[PDB]
């Protein structure tokens, strides 16, 4: 299978060779988020997580309230059953038994290297569903479903506050920071300690601007390695890139994937993992020029640590 491309591997995260061999065999260009969550749950790295007598029976009961079911003709007798379900309880923000809370902390300690390896395997194959693993990576940091309200990321945003936001058509983090003092204090019925934690989050939440330059557009030759420059600007230089997350109990640094690809062909042409630590920065990507004709290409700038802060740009090329 490893006729894989070295230049299409963005990170240096590591796990056992056993797990890498298993992941490579288990993932394809059609893998879904649910498939990837299952595959991740099978990592031998989780064998250090406790599995007690009675846990499976307790997990079966818990599973009633979770949206995704464990694969049908697969034994529920291993730690993978626990990992698959507790990670969903994490996304759903279910209150857990103290003992399952302990196991969840142990699980979360191992997830970042594992999800990054999933991204790297898919991207090394040129598979655009690497972006599906990126979606899952975001959920693992903020502890929120990709189908739930993205405002849930902000500390102390309970159901009452979410409904007050809906009533005035406030939907994004940027809508929150745009609010006038009196309307802001109307919705944010929170204590002093709580308000400071909202403030910490909103000030650190990224707002990036994506541009590019492609030298000699509409004069490209098929097959030749082509360079493209990607620039990303922030309003001011960040004082630190330490991620604010209520739910992820370990230190995390803000990182981004820069992705070039073509949606209609489900193909990833190039990828790069970057830190946007400056007011402005640019990066050079290299790809093989596709066949003769018109192609619609997209650049994505995807954050590993927050939801709804990603940026994308589409453009047309003509290969002679």
Swiss-Prot record:
Localization in the cell: Nucleus
Annotated ranges, domain SEC63: 3-317
Coiled-coil ranges from the UniProt annotation: none
Record note on quaternary structure: Component of the U4/U6-U5 tri-snRNP complex composed of the U4, U6 and U5 snRNAs and at least PRP3, PRP4, PRP6, PRP8, PRP18, PRP31, PRP38, SNU13, SNU23, SNU66, SNU114, SPP381, SMB1, SMD1, SMD2, SMD3, SMX2, SMX3, LSM2, LSM3, LSM4, LSM5, LSM6, LSM7, LSM8, BRR2 and DIB1. Interaction with PRP8 is important for recruitment to the U4/U6-U5 tri-snRNP complex.
Remarks, miscellaneous: Present with 1440 molecules/cell in log phase SD medium.
Domains (record comment): Contains two helicase domains. The N-terminal helicase domain has catalytic activity by itself, contrary to the C-terminal helicase domain that may have a regulatory role and enhance the activity of the first helicase domain.
UniProt similarity note: Belongs to the helicase family. SKI2 subfamily.
Function as written in the Swiss-Prot or TrEMBL entry: RNA helicase that plays an essential role in pre-mRNA splicing as component of the U5 snRNP and U4/U6-U5 tri-snRNP complexes. Involved in spliceosome assembly, activation and disassembly. Mediates changes in the dynamic network of RNA-RNA interactions in the spliceosome. Catalyzes the ATP-dependent unwinding of U4/U6 RNA duplices, an essential step in the assembly of a catalytically active spliceosome.
Protein name in the entry: Pre-mRNA-splicing helicase BRR2
Organism (species): Saccharomyces cerevisiae (strain ATCC 204508 / S288c) (Baker's yeast)
Gene name as annotated: BRR2
Section of the entire sequence shown: 1844 to 2163 of 2163
């Amino acid at each position: 299978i490893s006729t894989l491309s070295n230049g299409l591997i963005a990170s240096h995260y590591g796990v056992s060779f056993f797990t890498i061999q298993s992941f490579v065999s288990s993932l394809s260009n059609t893998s879904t988020l649910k498939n990837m969550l299952y595959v991740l749950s099978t990592a031998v790295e989780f064998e250090s997580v406790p599995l007690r007598k009675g846990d499976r029976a307790l997990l079966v009961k818990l599973s009633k309230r979770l949206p995704l079911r464990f694969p049908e003709h697969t034994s529920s007798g291993s730690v993978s059953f626990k990992v698959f379900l507790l990670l969903q309880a994490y996304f759903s923000r279910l209150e857990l038994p103290v003992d399952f809370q302990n196991d969840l902390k142990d699980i979360l300690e191992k997830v970042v290297p594992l999800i990054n390896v999933v991204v790297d395997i898919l991207s090394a194959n040129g598979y655009l569903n690497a972006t599906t693993a990126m979606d899952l990576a975001q959920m693992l940091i903020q502890g929120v479903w990709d189908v739930d309200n993205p405002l849930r990321q902000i500390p102390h945003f309970n159901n009452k506050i979410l409904e007050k936001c809906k009533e005035i058509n406030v939907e994004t983090v940027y809508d929150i920071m745009a609010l006038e003092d009196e309307e802001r204090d109307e919705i944010l019925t929170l204590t002093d300690s709580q308000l400071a934690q909202v403030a910490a989050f909103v000030n650190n939440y990224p707002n990036v601007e994506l541009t590019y330059s492609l030298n000699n557009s509409d004069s490209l030759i098929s097959g030749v390695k082509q360079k493209i420059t990607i620039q990303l600007t922030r309003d001011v230089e960040p004082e630190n890139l330490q991620v604010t997350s209520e739910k992820y109990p370990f230190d995390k640094l803000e990182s981004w994937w820069l992705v070039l690809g073509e949606v209609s062909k489900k193909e990833l042409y190039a990828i790069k993992k970057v830190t946007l630590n400056k007011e402005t920065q640019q990066y050079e990507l290299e790809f093989d020029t596709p066949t003769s004709g018109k192609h619609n290409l997209t650049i994505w700038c995807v954050c590993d640590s927050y939801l709804d802060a990603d940026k994308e740009l589409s453009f047309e090329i003509n290969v002679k």
